[PDB]
Amino acid sequence: GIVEQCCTSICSLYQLENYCN
Amino acid sequence: GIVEQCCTSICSLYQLENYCN
Amino acid sequence: GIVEQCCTSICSLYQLENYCN
Amino acid sequence: GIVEQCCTSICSLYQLENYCN
Amino acid sequence: GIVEQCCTSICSLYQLENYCN
Amino acid sequence: GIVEQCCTSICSLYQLENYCN
Amino acid sequence: FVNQHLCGSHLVEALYLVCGERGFFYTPKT
Amino acid sequence: FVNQHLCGSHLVEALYLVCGERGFFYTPKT
Amino acid sequence: FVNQHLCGSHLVEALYLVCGERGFFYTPKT
Amino acid sequence: FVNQHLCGSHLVEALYLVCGERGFFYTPKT
Amino acid sequence: FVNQHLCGSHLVEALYLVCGERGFFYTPKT
Amino acid sequence: FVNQHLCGSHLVEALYLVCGERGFFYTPKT
Ligand SMILES: [Cl-]
Ligand SMILES: [Cl-]
Ligand SMILES: [Zn+2]
Ligand SMILES: [Zn+2]
């Protein structure tokens, strides 16, 4: 999930947008 | 400038990106 | 909604708790 | 103290209230 | 007090330092 | 740099002022 | 707990603290 | 832009800054 | 609500959100 | 250092930075 | 991404997120 | 004042609080 993508691994701002509504 | 623009109006992440080194 | 309520008025942590998954 | 309770270990918001005045 | 002063006016880090334990 | 001085090692607020313009 | 006055990202921080591992949804108007 | 570790409240702050008015969900359990 | 690690500035932010107007003390030395 | 305009949790963050391991007390009016 | 309304330290946080390891400069007026 | 670890967004928040109107540069690469 987001934590694995962005905290445990690294993510871009674009990937973060995956979690917008 | 950007510091004022973002606070008195709005600004975009793209505008902000101009302030990266 | 809650985002507006908390900012234009006040809101409680109990109200906020309703927004947890 | 608070650091041991809440940072080193975990604490609830209620436990956090222990440190209110 | 300091909480109000810093928000309604300004305050210095030196003023703030008075609130350390 | 600042990260080494202040994150990896520790720095004072005065040392932080080294990075003001 | 006390009532809160939370704007902007402060609300999100509060939701984060309140919801913990449950997570939360942030749904502003418009 | 960059890729970096975003954890905890920083992660939700980042979501709040990327999504804004769209809103977002923070669902650490998946 | 939840139980979670609250450290550093996040801890005091959490105290600020739980205590608010009551105020609080943050005394890491104990 | 420069003078500060700090409301809400921003003040608490500032107190946190200024006081370090000493900690601090946050005592709003009323 | 959405447009931003960012004052104070919120702008700096945003710059931090946007610039990552590149860093950034924060240059207010006056 | 104190000496403490200031990392990441907390570092830039601290720079923002120490430098304020002077502005600052955050250049992690050196
Ligand atoms: Cl604010
Ligand atoms: Cl952290
Ligand atoms: Zn943090
Ligand atoms: Zn704020």
Strands L3-4 and K24-26, how do they pair? unpaired
Token pair belonging to G5: 């006055």
The number of CA neighbours under 13 Å toward the Cβ of G24 is 31
- CA E9 remoteness from chain centre: 10
Resolution (A): 1.5
Subunits adjacent to chain E (3 or more Cβ pairs under 8 Å): I, J, L
Local structure of K19: helix, strand or coil = helix
Angle at H18 between CA H15 and CA H20, to 5 degrees: 85
CB contact under 8 A, K28 and L15: no
Rounded-to-integer distance, Cα I15 and Cα I12, Å: 5
K-chain residues within 8 Å CB-CB of G9? 10, 13
Amino acid at L14: A
Q: Identity (one letter) of the amino acid at H3?
A: N
State the distance from the centre of ligand 3 to the C-alpha of I9, rounded, in angstroms: 7
Q: How far is the CA of G10 from the centre of ligand 4 (A)?
A: 6
**Do residues G16 and C13 lie in contact, with contact meaning Cβ atoms separated by under 8 Å?**
no
Please give, one letter per residue, the 3-state secondary structure of chain H. Answer: CCEECCCCHHHHHHHHHHHHHHCEEECCCC
Residues from chain J that touch E18, judged by Cβ atoms under 8 A, are none
Q: Which ligand is nearest to the CA of K14?
A: 4
CB distance L22 to J2 below 8 Å: yes
The pair phi, psi for residue K24, each rounded to 5°, is -165, 170
Measured in Å, residue J28 CA sits from the centre of ligand 3 at 24
Judging by DSSP bridges, how do beta strands L3-4 and F11-12 pair with one another?
antiparallel
The shortest CB-CB distance from I19 to any of G2, G17, G21 is to G2
Q: How far apart are CA L21 and CA K28, in angstroms?
A: 6
With an 8 Å Cβ cutoff, is L21 touching chain B?
no
How far apart CA B15 and CA K3 sit, in angstroms, is 10
Nearest CA to E6 out of B5, G2, J18 is that of J18
| Residue F19 Cα distances to B11, C13, F1, I9, K24, angstroms | 25, 38, 9, 21, 12
Q: Is B5 on the interface with K (CB under 8 A)?
A: no
The amino acid that residue J11 corresponds to is L
A17 DSSP 8-state letter: G
What's the one-letter identity of residue G22? R
Owner of token pair 């009532």: G3
| DSSP 3-state of B20 | strand
The structure's method of determination equals X-ray
> Measured between alpha carbons, how far is F20 from G25 in angstroms, rounded to an integer?
38
Tell me how far the alpha carbon of residue K11 lies from the centroid of ligand 2, in angstroms.
18
Distance of CA A4 to the CA centre of its chain: 8
Tell me the residue type at E4: E
Angstrom CA distances, H30 to A3, A4, A12, D3, I4, stand at: 9, 9, 19, 29, 18
Task: Catalogue the long-range contacts made by A7-11 (C-beta closer than 8 Å, 24 or more residues apart).
Answer: A7/H5, A7/H6, A7/H7, A7/H8, A7/H11, A8/H5, A9/H5, A10/H3, A10/H4, A10/H5, A10/H6, A11/H3, A11/H4, A11/H6
Q: Which two tokens stand for residue D5?
A: 């309770």
- Do residues J9 and G10 touch, judged by C-beta distance below 8 A? yes
Contact assessment for residue G7 and residue G15, using Cβ atoms and an 8 Å cutoff: no
End-to-end CA distance of chain J: 30
Rounded alpha-carbon distances, angstroms, from residue K9 to A16, H22, J5, K5, K14: 21, 23, 11, 12, 9
> Considering CB atoms only, which of J19, J21, J26 is closest to I16?
J26
Which residue does chain A place closest to H22, by CA atoms?
A21
Note down the domain range covering H14: 1-30
Check: CB of residue B16 under 8 Å from CB of residue K13. no
Residue with tokens 């601090």: J24
- Count of structural domains within chain I: 1
CB I13 within 8 A of CB D6: no
